Design a protein around this ligand. Structure first.
Ligand SMILES: O=C(O)CNC(=O)C(=O)O
Ligand SMILES: O=C(O)CNC(=O)C(=O)O
Ligand SMILES: O=C(O)CNC(=O)C(=O)O
Ligand SMILES: O=C(O)CNC(=O)C(=O)O
Ligand SMILES: [Mn+2]
Ligand SMILES: [Mn+2]
Ligand SMILES: [Mn+2]
Ligand SMILES: [Mn+2]
Lengths: 12, 459, 458, 12, 459, 458, 12, 12
């Protein structure tokens, strides 16, 4: 869906 | 001494963690007053703080630190590091599977790829303290990413993020373009956006070259992009916060509980629906001129409005606080805090035996919570549990929610301790039924690293 | 001819299934007028109808039917049949694992146990039609249990149920006691109740001896108990409906969707919470004098009120309708409906099949087989017609059945569902082409969701 | 308390 | 009276269910002697029994029965009925979703499709008894399919099945072609084969036109196909048995248990492997001239051969018997069996009350298992359980495994009853410690429908 | 220079990792010859090696190291550290939930509890290298625990473990008692044992006071216990290996595959069972005199014997090798191996990266980085090279890592794995093209699975 | 994989 | 009895 900045410190 | 190192030394001399957090944020946007920032700019405007001091962030993070962590730590592509490049108006990700060794990483950088470290706070203790302190005054998890871009290149396609972002220029310079929300719906967006092409963009509300020391803040929904121009790379650390911390999120948790409460306490919510409402309600009847329908919708609006009286606002506030405690990075203690806590007890190993044995609390011991934002008292299914952060990992949700049960005869004293910080309370004066309960609560919290004493225990 | 058999023969002559449902319910509470029952008694008062006709229900269900079921069907204890008794203020369940054979069941009955059949509509086509028709005017699933109690015994402990109940006395006599809701929380109760002891009960609001033909109705929340006294057993069929069909349930489905819509459409719902609200909100702070707390609460109530404007009411109505179709017992067709449907086509194996290949034509006149067998629901940019004609007489035994309706047929499908029982010339269906008209009608008909004015004779 | 009367015709 | 009805009447007059099963199979292949059939043809040869009696199967199943079950039962496409056709050397399946109403089914038949009923025994009680009896002498689940093919058509592509098949021609005629296994591996195949084209086939070992009354048997692995020629349809019922009931299947269950037993009882199986066997074992070393390797393989062969001494053969036999009891169709009682069992107790409802109340067993009651293949005593985890078939559904595995625990003081008597069928045993003479145990076992089994009495109970 | 530091310095000078592993084990049991230990003592006898050198292990692990770990690392009770004590013939575990801080740990120690570190190799790079090297000559995972006991106490109850154990006395003194397997079933036991009481034990086969430098080895199944007597504590590191690495386990993996292969390839395994074998087989029939039963048993034993011929022995060996690679601790590189690998390439951030873009060429000479870091395994018509270089020092923390090898490189991959430590000119790799040679070598090298004779200087 | 005769009386 | 000695370095 689009995720550029990884706030939680990890991908999904 | 650099400004960052000066303020960090300064924080260590500040007793309250609440005040420490406030002071560090003050430093972050200086000279801009925090009160003005939150009142007028937070979630409303893009802001550039032209520092005119290239040494401002020295000690926070550098490219040397990155290089060293690639060789000394187990940095994995995908999980910890991304390598991307934006060319031809197209985003490409080049992560090879496996470990991101210096040879591979720098090879990608040399070919035009930007490198992005997802959890710098897991490899750097400076970044960790920085975010651990700031999270206390955000009242929200403070995450971060580090971006290293080679000269004459763009790593990512324009997009907007789902968080409040504070960009800290650490090395080199970078041409940034920030655009205001394109439409009503993109204002304070809920989710990250897809990658946009330039044709999807209007005019930048902000276009400038950031210089080490500079700060650039912008709300979620504000599209941005950035590029390195001739001859110099760019390294910056983006601090992020406020992910899904909206009023709508609060309502999401509230509503199911409200309607359940209403149904259990007010018969109007338990009455049966019409036997024939399917005759005039439904997409097939969106244009029915049946008044029964108007009456149906009106009743719906009335009952919904009513739910406000049944909303368990305090319980949802506690739940969110509990999830924030779980989200939290563990505390970074001041020399004094450590020295007056179980963490600093002088007991260790020398020769063949433990030395400086058995310090013990007494009713005369003056105590208070180790810090203000490390614990939260919550009620669940007839029980009370104190959730704390002191055993959380620097990695988001690596360790699960930690708590310890608080027995009824200790609830008053636990609430007291939680609300008097940083005021000292003689253990003997804690609102408990027996002295056994006073010493027991203070001992359990102290041994847990949730409490500190006025004078270091020496018994 | 018993009144039941007479009203059923009469239903077979009533063209509309909607009218048919209304008529059977009217028969169910006669002489009491339905309008009056729903306006003044439904969900409000306990009602007793002294029929003065021991034969009123003749043909619905008897103890001879239960006996034959035991010998001729796979009746299981627990699953299909329960055996209980109430003694010394204690409820005891005496189910042997396994199948309930005549020997075991009647032995328990002889020992003073009441036998209760959980799904007589799965074993009796009469009880099935009865419930299948009534469900159409309740707009809610209609279930039932049969209760058989031996003389001088009480099978169950006083309790209130979670459904609207219509007790129909079939055989013998039974002393019933019905009580008004003990407290405000028990009125129109959400869930069934624990077993109560006599010390828990106040004075009955209705105490009477039910006799075959009589009817007793009482809302969920109304505690009740019943005992057989000296010399005669009791057999009754309790008809149930309206399980979790309240306004609260509707809201339950509405709210999540409402809040999501509000967040997507109005920025006030997407604004951040205060950075320090945890300092004044929480059980820890319920008596705080912080003005911020009062502002926080007010804002919560204002935003919640606003939600009414974003509530997708029609979509939830459709979802509940879809669930109801899934819940529904399959339809009972009249001789006419069958004769004019695919179910009655004379095609059969009479060494080769005879009379097959009959076709619909633009001249064929059609209309939905019945009024409550289908529902058009939109999900993810797609339209699906959910129906009941393939449902099992056993609750949720088969999963939701539906067929997709293409946009080029949507208008005609709504029309057909909307104009029952008016006959519509297939050629006059609001479709783009003649192919679309013929294909929609052929499809529905082959599914058994449609009937023609004249039996397809092609 | 349990469903004294089993509305849906099967125990749960 | 037709031969089928004559033999069925005959079975009702035969006391033993074991003998009943043997007699029915005798009837099935008459005039061929069963002893010759099993000795020489079973699993070895294709067999045609040209009956010369078109009435042989009358009463078993007919097309009229099919038509009627489509309108009176809930026959579903896919789940209960398939419609297929073989044309252009290609198989096609035409199952519409949903109920298979007469109009749809016959429409498909008219267009050339064959119809196949998957579980005729669930809709026909005649087919049910037929298979329920035959399963007792097969010692394996006996299933069946019904095939109706229209004139001038083929429904399925040539293939072979994974079961022993007995084709019973019921109506019309059909040209069959049976081929012997094409290769060593296809002999007594384990799984159904893919659809074959004619090019994949050799010469038929059997090619003939079946006539109502005829029987055609062939082993799993034997490819077959069949077609209706001019002017007449075909209806046949294929009885199937022996699916995965091989020696290899027995070993599959045995081995894990054998090796575990060996490891627990013999130290040679617990010794450690070589520290360096990976140096000479592995696909990469399949050609190593290292003798250590030859020694490795030799040791493997020795230990494997050894496992024979540790194989729990009786326990696996019991497990398979338990699974067969679970697989079994429920018994079809003879008038006498029903009349002398709980199923036939005269207690029912008349007027307002139960009549013919309370017959009870006494030590004088002479009993014996209702039938020989309806129960099996099995040991599991220190407990003994009697699994039975009397509550099984006519639908394969619709109801789960049913059993009742047998207490230690009843085990001897339960074994006795299981091994003396059909010899009568006075309840008082059952090997039990107390009389309470004798009456209790007999009462529990009787009430379960697992026992019958010499004289109908009348108490 | 302590003997440990001296042998490690010596290992850094030994070219082959295989030779390096053999040398460290030789050092571990010196003066006893390895050949002799494995031929006569391994899995057979308890062995005591009186070193007569209190400094033999200096540098491996000390109590000061454990202390610093407690203060400077996230050591958790239960997960990383256990605290137990044995009193009145009763074992008690005293773990507080949460992290084990110096205060808590030493308080328990002062109260007479033994502290046991479950994975010192995750906290010490020395213990890690030690185990990483030894695992290469065991051909099995090498784990370890550290045990610290206070003076005058017994931390654990007598028991036998499920692994081959080498106790290394690090500090203090401890009275050990080792017993031979109580019964035939306990010899080379499969699983760990329950806690035993003194009444369960016979006479020790070995009773001695271990002193720093000493080594004690005993096979799984050998019960043991140990206590600290007056005035001194004890600290020891127990090295473990060979957990479920028996012939029985191999067979376990072999059999299912064997029987399946037999069934697919030989018709005797596909023939039907007797139609009536249930009449004579079963516990019910164990004493039957039916000859059929004897024939049935004989047939079972003959078919089982035949299985040996269908056993896919090499495939199981490969599967166990793959599991071992997954089990393995990551490799410890010598200064040379690093300097000649991708790990030592001088490329670094010295405002731009320096010295990058180095390339392999057909002239480059290469060979596997080490001997036990990789394994080639075939699965479903595909070849995968599984390696250990990215494994965590924590058991199974990361899942199996592998990269696919294409058939056009299979021969060269086997060659490289087979000729270590012989240097192979990349151009002479048995590949179809020069592209294949260059790509295989480049890939392996970039993964850190290969080294060059000369440091890539390009 | 190919299943022509449905021995167990149902598909898969 | 349990793994007195935790060979794999983590409890289970
Ligand atoms: O640096 C870039 O090219 C993009 N950076 C970001 O999107 C950010 O910091 O949130
Ligand atoms: O008949 C009884 O004893 C109890 N009956 C009921 O509770 C009922 O019909 O809902
Ligand atoms: O009848 C057919 O066309 C095929 N029949 C079968 O494959 C069978 O009976 O096993
Ligand atoms: O040290 C102890 O008390 C017990 N030690 C062991 O069991 C061991 O090292 O395997
Ligand atoms: Mn961004
Ligand atoms: Mn009730
Ligand atoms: Mn076939
Ligand atoms: Mn041990």
């Amino acid at each position: 869906g689009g995720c550029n900045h990884q706030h939680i410190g990890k991908p999904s | 001494m650099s400004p960052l190192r000066r303020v960090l030394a300064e924080l260590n001399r500040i007793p309250s963690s609440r005040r420490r957090a406030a002071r560090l944020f003050e430093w972050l946007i200086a000279p801009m007053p925090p009160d003005h920032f939150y009142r007028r700019l937070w979630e409303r405007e893009a802001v550039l703080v032209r520092r005119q001091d290239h040494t401002y962030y020295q000690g926070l993070f550098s490219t040397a630190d990155l290089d060293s962590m690639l060789r000394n730590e187990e940095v994995q592509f995908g999980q910890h590091l991304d390598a991307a490049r934006y060319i031809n108006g197209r985003r490409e990700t080049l992560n090879p599977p496996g470990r991101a060794l210096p040879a591979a990483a720098w090879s990608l950088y040399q070919a035009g790829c930007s490198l992005r470290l997802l959890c710098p706070q897991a490899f750097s203790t400076t970044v960790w303290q920085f975010l651990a302190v700031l999270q206390e005054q955000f009242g929200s998890m403070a995450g971060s990413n580090v971006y290293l871009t080679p000269p004459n290149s763009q790593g990512f396609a324009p997009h907007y993020d789902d968080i409040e972002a504070f960009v800290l220029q650490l090395e080199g310079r970078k041409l940034w373009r920030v655009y205001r929300p394109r439409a009503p719906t993109e204002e304070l967006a809920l989710t990250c956006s897809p990658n946009f092409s330039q044709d999807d963009l209007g005019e930048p509300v902000l276009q400038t070259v950031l210089e080490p020391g500079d700060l650039l803040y912008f709300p979620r929904g504000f599209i941005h992009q950035a590029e390195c121009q001739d001859g110099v790379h760019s390294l910056h650390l983006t601090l992020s916060t406020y992910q899904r911390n909206t009023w709508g999120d609060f309502l999401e948790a509230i509503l199911p509980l409200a309607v359940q409460a209403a149904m259990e306490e007010n018969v109007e919510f338990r009455r049966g629906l019409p036997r024939d409402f399917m005759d005039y309600m439904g997409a097939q009847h969106s244009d029915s001129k049946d008044p029964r329908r108007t009456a149906f919708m009106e009743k719906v609006r009335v009952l919904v409005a009513r739910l406000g009286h049944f909303a368990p606002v305090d319980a949802v506030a506690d739940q969110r606080a509990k999830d924030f405690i779980h989200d939290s990075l563990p505390p970074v203690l001041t020399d004094r805090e450590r020295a007056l806590s179980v963490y600093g007890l002088p007991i260790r190993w020398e020769a063949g035996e433990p030395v400086n044995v058995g310090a013990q609390l007494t009713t005369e011991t003056e105590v208070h919570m180790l810090q203000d934002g490390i614990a939260r008292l919550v009620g669940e299914g007839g029980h009370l549990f104190l959730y704390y952060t002191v055993e959380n990992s620097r990695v988001y949700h690596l360790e699960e929610p930690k708590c310890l049960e608080i027995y009824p005869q200790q609830a008053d004293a636990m609430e007291l301790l939680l609300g008097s910080y940083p005021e000292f309370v003689r253990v003997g004066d804690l609102p408990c039924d027996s002295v056994e309960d006073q010493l027991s609560l203070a001992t359990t919290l102290y041994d847990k690293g949730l409490l500190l004493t006025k004078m270091p225990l020496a018994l």
